[PDB]
Amino acid sequence: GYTLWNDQIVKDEEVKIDKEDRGYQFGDGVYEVVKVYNGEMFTVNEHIDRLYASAEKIRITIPYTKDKFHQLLHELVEKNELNTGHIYFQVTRGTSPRAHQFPENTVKPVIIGYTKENPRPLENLEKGVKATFVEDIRWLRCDIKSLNLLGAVLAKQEAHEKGCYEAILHRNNTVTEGSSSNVFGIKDGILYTHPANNMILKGITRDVVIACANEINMPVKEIPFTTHEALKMDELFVTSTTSEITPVIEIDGKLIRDGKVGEWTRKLQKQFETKIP
Amino acid sequence: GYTLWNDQIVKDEEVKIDKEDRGYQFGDGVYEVVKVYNGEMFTVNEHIDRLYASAEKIRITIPYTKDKFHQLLHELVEKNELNTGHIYFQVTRGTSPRAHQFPENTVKPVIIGYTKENPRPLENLEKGVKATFVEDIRWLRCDIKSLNLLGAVLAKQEAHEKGCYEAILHRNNTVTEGSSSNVFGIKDGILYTHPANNMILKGITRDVVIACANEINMPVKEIPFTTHEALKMDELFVTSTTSEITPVIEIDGKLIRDGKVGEWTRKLQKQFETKIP
Ligand SMILES: Cc1ncc(COP(=O)(O)O)c(CNC2CONC2=O)c1O
Ligand SMILES: Cc1ncc(COP(=O)(O)O)c(CNC2CONC2=O)c1O
């Protein structure tokens, strides 16, 4: 297929990364993932906004305007004939002789973007999945969507080895987010989720779900809960650009309530469905 | 020059890195830096043992034996005609379609290694440097020498913008290590340094400096110290494969004692000198 390399659309084969690209040596870069539903990009402006926000937090100046980057993404979708799946794009500080400090503001950032066909995980949305609690050992700037994802890969692998779909991370027993998602809990018609601070990534899906809750008049409390309190919830689910609204019906062999998708989780999924292209 | 690429020493122009190499997308890899003095590698075996340990901690299997990696670095040094500088080598989990969890055991790791001419830091070793305190916000597995270095690059940059050489990190007021070095303090002829746990990298230079202390009858206590205690030290200095033993004479405008390189630092530098090829 075709890949986005800076401001050019090229065949995958023509793309080569330099050994001294800062994203290869320091994980010095940021990224985003956007879901495409039948040719249309879902919440593309919000993801672009967050990419530029993440870049700014680590002081990376993206050389193109948001309008140009938007046009670039559209061209990438049209050329790859992407129907349903997602676009992955990242920006690193650039190539420069190895040194921890920033280069000389000449080094142009390196932008890489590509597509992948991937249907909605319908079966997981319907039946729910199994999860597991894993100690959160990541750094203290989880609000930045950077390429430093080693903590998340190790947590995801521990989950996959136990036959679970996602690892629910916790710091001192206080639930934060999943290795690649945000976590929500419902008790007596009230929606609970960790507030948006340096401890979690302010997910775009997470925000759309909170909007959906306000729309159906379901109260929301952005208050942290513990692993033990999570097990005492009536319903539990995780959110991500790829997972959408995935129900968690079991954690470490302990069923959530009856082990069935709850009443409110279905009302949110239904309200979410109205926003999809 | 020539670059070590997997098991072959090739021309740099022939090396091609894939966009889906896990080192580029997740910082999923480990690395090392070996110093070379007039064509001879310093503490090679120590650095090689650590590379294998680091990889082992994140479940990466290096396909060659330690003997083959050593002859390869030797070859790399011969081919590049390296006199005094360093070798940089890294190992990533490999190339595989983007997914957080480990790929199938069929994918082989990617190994990259190269050299750089860089003289010994004469001025710094003789006159000492200025450092600055920066809060440690890195992950909790600092004992692994991985490519997830964004926390370190932001700290080092903060230090450079202030006119400082190194950033001395502290986690909840307890001094851990520097953005790219280990930190030592001296009070009453006693050597103090943070113990080797998940909070710091067990540096090779660090261990050598501890071997040097025992050789000159100097008592060593691996007990952590706070920022307030660091400023009350008689002597302060940082260690690393490239900085060797660099004296820190000031931190944020506060002189360490009289602002001159102390007596025990010099003795330690003198003893270290006897180990250099
Ligand atoms: C740690 C973490 N928290 C939350 C989310 C959910 O954010 P969004 O709702 O905006 O998607 C993600 C998405 N991470 C992704 C999405 O695909 N691959 C990733 O690395 C994540 O990695
Ligand atoms: C965080 C950190 N602690 C300690 C050390 C000192 O370890 P050694 O004594 O074994 O070198 C380093 C060296 N890091 C280096 C050395 O050069 N490039 C780097 O990233 C380091 O990055």
Side-chain angles (χ1 to χ4, degrees), chain A residues 44-54 56 62-74:
Chain A
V44 72
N45 302 310
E46 288 81 8
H47 282 276
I48 294 304
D49 280 0
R50 198 173 62 181
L51 180 85
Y52 279 65
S54 293
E56 192 172 341
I62 299 171
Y64 315 131
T65 58
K66 292 187 178 181
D67 297 293
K68 173 80 173 304
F69 208 111
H70 194 341
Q71 180 59 267
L72 263 22
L73 291 187
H74 193 250

Side-chain angles (χ1 to χ4, degrees), chain B residues 36-50:
Chain B
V36 177
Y37 297 101
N38 292 146
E40 273 201 53
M41 300 176 281
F42 185 46
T43 49
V44 210
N45 296 315
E46 282 85 349
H47 283 272
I48 291 187
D49 285 350
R50 200 172 67 177

